[PDB]
Structure 1
Amino acid sequence: ATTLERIEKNFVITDPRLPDNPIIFASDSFLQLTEYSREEILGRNARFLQGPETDRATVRKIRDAIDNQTEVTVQLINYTKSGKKFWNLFHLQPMRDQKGDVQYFIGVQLDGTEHVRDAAEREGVMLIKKTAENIDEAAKELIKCVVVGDGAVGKTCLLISYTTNAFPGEYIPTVFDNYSANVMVDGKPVNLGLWDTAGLEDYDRLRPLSYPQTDVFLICFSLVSPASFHHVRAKWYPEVRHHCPNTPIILVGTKLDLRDDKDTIEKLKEKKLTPITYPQGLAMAKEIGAVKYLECSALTQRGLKTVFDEAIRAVLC
Structure 2
Amino acid sequence: LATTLERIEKNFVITDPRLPDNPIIFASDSFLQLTEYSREEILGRNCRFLQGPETDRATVRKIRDAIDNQTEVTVQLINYTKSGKKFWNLFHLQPMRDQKGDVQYFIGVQLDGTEHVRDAAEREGVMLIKKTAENIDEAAKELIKCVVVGDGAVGKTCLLISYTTNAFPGEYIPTVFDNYSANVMVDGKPVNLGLWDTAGLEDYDRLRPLSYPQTDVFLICFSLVSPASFHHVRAKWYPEVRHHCPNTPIILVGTKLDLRDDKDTIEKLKEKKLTPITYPQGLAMAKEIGAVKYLECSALTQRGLKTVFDEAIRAVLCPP
Q: Does 1:10 align with 2:11?
A: yes
**Pairwise CA distance, 1:297:** 0.3
> Does the 8 Å CA contact 2:95/2:105 hold for their aligned counterparts?
yes
> Does the 8 Å CA contact 2:96/2:104 hold for their aligned counterparts?
yes
Aligned CA-pair RMSD: 0.3
**Pairwise CA distance, 1:257:** 0.3
**Pairwise CA distance, 1:75:** 0.2
**Pairwise CA distance, 1:89:** 0.2
Query: Aligned partners of 1:269 and 1:120: how far apart in 2?
Result: 72
**Pairwise CA distance, 1:223:** 0.2
Query: Aligned partners of 2:40 and 2:59: how far apart in 1?
Result: 28
Query: Aligned partners of 1:134 and 1:5: how far apart in 2?
Result: 12
Q: Which residue pairs with 1:91 in the alignment?
A: 92
**Pairwise CA distance, 1:105:** 0.2
Residues 58-80 of structure 1: per-residue CA shift (max 9 Å, x gap): 00000000000000000000000
**Total equivalences in the alignment:** 317
Residues 170-213 of structure 1: per-residue CA shift (max 9 Å, x gap): 10000000000000000000000000000000000000000000
Residues 27-85 of structure 1: per-residue CA shift (max 9 Å, x gap): 00000000111011000000000000000000000000000000000000000011111
> Does the 8 Å CA contact 2:283/2:294 hold for their aligned counterparts?
yes
Query: Aligned partners of 2:80 and 2:271: how far apart in 1?
Result: 55
Q: Which residue pairs with 2:25 in the alignment?
A: 24
Q: Which residue pairs with 2:202 in the alignment?
A: 201
Q: TM-score, normalised by structure 1?
A: 1.00
Unaligned segments of structure 2, at least 5 residues: none
Output aligned runs, 1:123-202, within 5 Å: 123-202=124-203
Q: Which residue pairs with 1:296 in the alignment?
A: 297
> Does the 8 Å CA contact 2:88/2:112 hold for their aligned counterparts?
yes
SS at match of 2:89: strand
Query: Aligned partners of 1:125 and 1:161: how far apart in 2?
Result: 39
Query: Aligned partners of 2:43 and 2:317: how far apart in 1?
Result: 25
Query: Aligned partners of 1:149 and 1:257: how far apart in 2?
Result: 19
Query: Aligned partners of 2:137 and 2:59: how far apart in 1?
Result: 24
**Pairwise CA distance, 1:19:** 0.1
> Does the 8 Å CA contact 2:158/2:170 hold for their aligned counterparts?
no
SS at match of 2:19: coil
Query: Aligned partners of 2:222 and 2:40: how far apart in 1?
Result: 24
**Pairwise CA distance, 1:239:** 0.1
**Pairwise CA distance, 1:96:** 0.1
SS at match of 1:180: strand
Tell me the percent identity. 100
SS at match of 2:75: strand
Residues 255-292 of structure 1: per-residue CA shift (max 9 Å, x gap): 00000000000000000000000000000000000000
Query: Aligned partners of 2:115 and 2:166: how far apart in 1?
Result: 40
Residues 212-241 of structure 1: per-residue CA shift (max 9 Å, x gap): 000000000000000000000000000000
SS at match of 1:159: helix
Runs of 4+ in 1 over 2 A off after TM superposition: none
Query: Aligned partners of 1:31 and 1:14: how far apart in 2?
Result: 15
**Pairwise CA distance, 1:169:** 1.9
**Pairwise CA distance, 1:102:** 0.1
Query: Aligned partners of 1:257 and 1:229: how far apart in 2?
Result: 17
Query: Aligned partners of 2:308 and 2:287: how far apart in 1?
Result: 17
Q: TM-score, normalised by structure 2?
A: 0.99
Q: Which residue pairs with 1:270 in the alignment?
A: 271
Query: Aligned partners of 1:309 and 1:40: how far apart in 2?
Result: 25
Query: Aligned partners of 2:65 and 2:244: how far apart in 1?
Result: 30
**Pairwise CA distance, 1:120:** 0.5
SS at match of 1:57: helix
